[PDB]
């Protein structure tokens, strides 16, 4: 709202009010279009979603009319004037917008206008976010339903960071009927999605694409391929080809398309997220927000949380060795709070279909974890049905995770992705179970066996596929698969990274009002 003192005649002041009525109405609407995108995502420079249903009305010749001859009314609801609000985008900078409201009132005409700089967070949505690798970021076959973001090595922007010549497919849809009886773990609205919002981004480096590689499909194809310094760093036999089961099928194709892009999140760097931004490091955050937190320096197991609640010796017995393996004997790491709330994790064994409930977030430092049998999970943190398990390194020991059986959420409790269990591993992750449904972070590398599929997302410094569980050699030629399933920001494991494309800004660069007639 803008208030000022004047000595102008009543006539011109009413012309100003008419215009200022238009500007401040649609400055609010413009800001509201800015908050609706901080909640598929498309930038403001490509139009507005005036409905708020995904229908975008674009800018024509950099201009978009928001209101033509709309009338301003007095307190009694009679016409005092008309105004016309027009929204203009800058030809050069796709973040600069000018809102203009020409007003008229009783034969007096006034014009007021404001320039904004608007940029959205653009929460990154990819099946695989890769880090810095070893000079290899994805090794071995893969079929990725979702985006793949790779950061690369800033001190070598000439390194092919993806030399896919076959053995690699990246799609922008999935349907969960194609997998063995896992559809009853996911919410109806989430079982077949045809817009995954996939893209290929590589911040530092080049990429090569050879025959039978498939970045998108002729029908449903990827929403952009933004690599390195420009379109120059998109090499290969298959660029511009978009025939079926070959080539790069893309809408847009240039260089890395992000300002303020996020670095690979690491335990020892600040992680600016709704839960962890106050702490100096992501690790300090996990440590401090953990419900259950156990450390292990050599043979000592020191409990650091819950500091005012008791544990069962069964719980601490299980991690004696420095490796928590679940398998065939139940382990109860829960405790009860002051107010009758539970905390920790509990792992029952059935004979059939196991259970691992997690109440709040739990982090084990200097401890490895292996879940050696299929297990259903249930997780909550008071209101929300989400939680995190962290295995962190401590003195170079621990921090690895092994999921050798299936790992799904329990249908009874909740359904994906309104029910998710997240995994932070500072070391490596090896999945030999056929189906695990979780968002996953591996500070080191994330290994997976041909044939097994992970639903959720992997953030990891390296991704690798292997021929068999026996193996740890990355050279593989068959395919593992990752299926990106968006998890809504609410009911998302708080202690996981929330990677943003850019910084959120809604800032006024200038404001002006001119009288144009009497």
Author numbering: 1 to 39, 49 to 142, 144 to 528
What does the paper say about this structure?
Natural competence is the term used to describe the uptake of “naked” extracellular DNA by bacteria; it plays a significant role in horizontal genetic exchange. Previous work on T. thermophilus HB27 by Friedrich et al. identified a locus containing five open reading frames (ORFs) associated with natural competence. Four ORFs (pilA1 to pilA4 [pilA1-4]) were type IVa pilin-like genes, and a fifth, comZ, encoded an unusual and much larger protein that lacked some of the sequence features characteristic of pilin genes. Mutation of pilA1-3 and comZ leads to a loss of natural competence, although piliation is maintained.
ComZ was crystallized and the structure was determined to 2.72-Å resolution. The structure had three ComZ molecules in the asymmetric unit, but analysis by the protein interface analysis server PISA did not indicate any significant crystal contacts. ComZ was not identified as a type IV pilin by PilFind, presumably because it does not contain key characteristic sequence motifs; however, the N-terminal domain adopts a type IV pilin-like fold, suggesting that it forms a structural component of a pilus fiber. The second domain forms a complex β-solenoid structure, which is inserted between the penultimate and last β-strands in the pilin fold through two short linkers. From a comparison of the three chains, the relative orientation of the two domains is invariant. The closest match was the type II secretion system pseudopilin GspK, which forms the tip of a pseudopilus heterotrimeric complex (GspK/GspI/GspJ). In fact, the β-solenoid domain is placed in line with the central axis of the fiber, placing it in an ideal orientation to act as a tip adhesin. Protection against reductive dimethylation was used in combination with mass spectrometry and site-directed mutagenesis to identify two lysine residues in ComZ which are involved in DNA binding. They are located between the two domains in ComZ, on the opposite side from the predicted PilA2 binding site.
